Amino acid sequence: AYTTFSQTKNDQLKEPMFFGQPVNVARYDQQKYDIFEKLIEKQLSFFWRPEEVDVSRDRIDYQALPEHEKHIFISNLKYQTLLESIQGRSPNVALLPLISIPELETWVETWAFSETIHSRSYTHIIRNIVNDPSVVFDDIVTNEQIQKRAEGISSYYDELIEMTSYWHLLGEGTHTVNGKTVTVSLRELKKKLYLCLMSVNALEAIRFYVSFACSFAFAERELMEGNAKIIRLIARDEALHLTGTQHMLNLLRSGADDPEMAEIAEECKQECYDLFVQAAQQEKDWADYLFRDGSMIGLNKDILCQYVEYITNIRMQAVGLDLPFNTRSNPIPWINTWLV
Amino acid sequence: AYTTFSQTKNDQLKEPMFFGQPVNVARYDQQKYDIFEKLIEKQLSFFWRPEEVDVSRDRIDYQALPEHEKHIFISNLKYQTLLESIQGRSPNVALLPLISIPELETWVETWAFSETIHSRSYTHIIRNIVNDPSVVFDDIVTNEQIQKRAEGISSYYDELIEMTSYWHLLGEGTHTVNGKTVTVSLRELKKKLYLCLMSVNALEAIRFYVSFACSFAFAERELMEGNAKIIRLIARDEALHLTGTQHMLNLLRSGADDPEMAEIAEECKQECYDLFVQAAQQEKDWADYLFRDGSMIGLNKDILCQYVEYITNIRMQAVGLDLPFNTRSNPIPWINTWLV
Ligand SMILES: [Fe+3]
Ligand SMILES: [Fe+3]
Ligand SMILES: [Fe+3]
Ligand SMILES: [Fe+3]
Ligand SMILES: [Hg+2]
Ligand SMILES: [Hg+2]
Ligand SMILES: [Hg+2]
Ligand SMILES: [Hg+2]
Ligand SMILES: [Hg+2]
Ligand SMILES: [Hg+2]
Ligand SMILES: [Hg+2]
Ligand SMILES: [Hg+2]
Ligand SMILES: [Hg+2]
Ligand SMILES: [Hg+2]
Ligand SMILES: [O]
Ligand SMILES: [O]
């Protein structure tokens, strides 16, 4: 029941963000929520080309790094690459088919595009600091430790995508597919989308910032400057991305959009909460692998765990969730230098 | 089923363009088909922003235009806008779930993004010439003369998408859904893909170029020059888009990527041929509506039909199809000043 151009003439200002009539005409002279049009404009003004960034000094710095520091740097970079690869395609494949207002549709496609740029920036770095990029990339696929911290992200997207396909193909109701009773509930699909959004928020607002911190710890040492410039540009984009999800989520919560969504947000707020807690624990567990061969002066498991609790509390409060961790001050104030 | 991150470590250099294992790691240090990485690079270097183009004098030009000429200009514009709206979302929703090599996946996302920039530019133009955009945007959805090609185009995409979902959910075989038998064949799915692709090639290589001619005729008379500058940038991007689909199609029919595709394409060559002729015929018929109240300088029914046939022959030959029209030289050499 999905269409690349619905023939019904509809008022796009009255459609909900998700699950309404598929978007027809892409117009930008008006919007239901101008925040998304503002995000598109901002992201477009931030356009940057990875290959332009000079990383010729990074090869020297990297090779000069002690084995354990190279391990920290490379493990962190491989994790960023993993998430970036997923973020480049998922917003488009999982969300795009469910959007019913033009400004949000284009925001998602712009957001997804900026992610491929980030992935390209990572190839640019890897390619210039290692002899064979294939070892780094192949390792990303295997290596349980990396897939361990990312566990749950791709599977959630995949589940939303599958449920969406059933909805579009069969419509709401109880069906019989190859002798099996398959239930298709729009309410259930909405919750899956809602929670997918919460997970993407946790991903970009928490997981990536923890990685930024690890990257900048080297920048603080006057090392890996090329990579540092790239991380600064990426973080600049990420701030827009998480701003977008925080708005989608808080707007759905307000009851000003789809009424059922506000009900859903309230109904499963414990799931939203649990999603962040698990995400936070995963970042902590990752520390054991990251520092397996040793840590660095101002970068270890304790400092990383403290930062996770710090950033998690801030992100959760921004979407109206109770705080799971004790409140504390920024364990690494030096990161402000590299951010904003 | 589809996944946003296949856990199997595979060789992306040996996967076919479509239907192979979903792409995991987005890497750009290597590629099976170099052309896609070059197109991404070129498209990025062509980045531009509609808002930066001065279109301040187009409103006065449009108002002074004779009624029939206003009709010609606005009808043409509405058609282009319709097509960009489709091209912005469709490549992503339709092709992404079927791509199995990284360079092709990112090209499609970059190509799609590029299309949203074009849609944004049309809003920029429309807002600075009618000061009442809604009338223009709503007519796109319902205009009978326009909503004929749109239907066929959206139909190919929609059918491919639907068959793709069935394949991903149920796989090949004979299934039952609520008392009905549902057959899923990979051969038929591959044919549909080959068919969207051929149709998209005609959309960008023929349909849009005819519209470019409709647009630059005004520029030749030093009118609607704001619009003209924007169309030049769009046509510049379009050359890359058609180059992309041409390579996809030639690789698929040559048998170097998938022997079954080469086999399938040879079987439906007559269908493809007719598909191309039909597209050309729709563009021709559009002339009766465009010049129903009179034609203009250097542009009329006969000239347009000549250009359609000239362009169609070139594009079809480029993808290995026979020429349906009598050969001739460019009927409007002056167009080359705005194209290539
Ligand atoms: Fe990113
Ligand atoms: Fe992001
Ligand atoms: Fe376009
Ligand atoms: Fe195009
Ligand atoms: Hg998700
Ligand atoms: Hg860190
Ligand atoms: Hg819920
Ligand atoms: Hg919640
Ligand atoms: Hg802690
Ligand atoms: Hg198509
Ligand atoms: Hg024309
Ligand atoms: Hg064919
Ligand atoms: Hg064809
Ligand atoms: Hg003709
Ligand atoms: O990002
Ligand atoms: O295009």
UniProtKB/Swiss-Prot annotation, chains A, B:
Induction pattern: Induced 4.2-fold by hydroxyurea (at protein level).
Residues at the catalytic site: 122
Covalent S-S links between cysteines: none
Enzyme class: oxidoreductase
PROSITE patterns: RIBORED_SMALL
Enzyme Commission numbers on file: 1.17.4.1
Binding site for Fe cation 2: 115, 204, 238, 241
Cofactor: how and how many bound: Binds 2 iron ions per subunit.
Keywords assigned: Deoxyribonucleotide synthesis, Iron, Metal-binding, Oxidoreductase
Pfam families from the UniProt entry: Ribonuc_red_sm (PF00268)
A GO term from the CC aspect: cytosol
GO biological process: 2'-deoxyribonucleotide biosynthetic process; deoxyribonucleotide biosynthetic process; nucleobase-containing small molecule interconversion; ribonucleoside diphosphate metabolic process
Catalytic activity: a 2'-deoxyribonucleoside 5'-diphosphate + [thioredoxin]-disulfide + H2O = a ribonucleoside 5'-diphosphate + [thioredoxin]-dithiol
Protein activity control: Inhibited by hydroxyurea, leads to dNTP depletion, replication fork arrest and genomic instability.
InterPro entries: Ferritin-like_SF, RNR-like, RNR_small, RNR_small_AS, RNR_small_fam
Cofactor: Fe cation
GO molecular function per UniProt: identical protein binding; iron ion binding; ribonucleoside-diphosphate reductase activity, thioredoxin disulfide as acceptor
Amino acids binding Fe cation 1: 84, 115, 118
Function: Provides the precursors necessary for DNA synthesis. Catalyzes the biosynthesis of deoxyribonucleotides from the corresponding ribonucleotides. R2 contains the tyrosyl radical required for catalysis.
PANTHER family, per database record: RIBONUCLEOSIDE-DIPHOSPHATE REDUCTASE SMALL CHAIN, RIBONUCLEOSIDE-DIPHOSPHATE REDUCTASE SUBUNIT M2
Additional facts recorded: E.coli produces two separate class I enzymes. This one is the functional enzyme during growth.
Family named by the database record: Belongs to the ribonucleoside diphosphate reductase small chain family.
Assembly, per entry: Tetramer of two alpha (R1) and two beta (R2) subunits. The B1 protein is a dimer of alpha subunits. A radical transfer pathway occurs between Tyr-122 of R2 and R1.
Name this protein carries in UniProt: Ribonucleoside-diphosphate reductase 1 subunit beta
Species of provenance: Escherichia coli (strain K12)
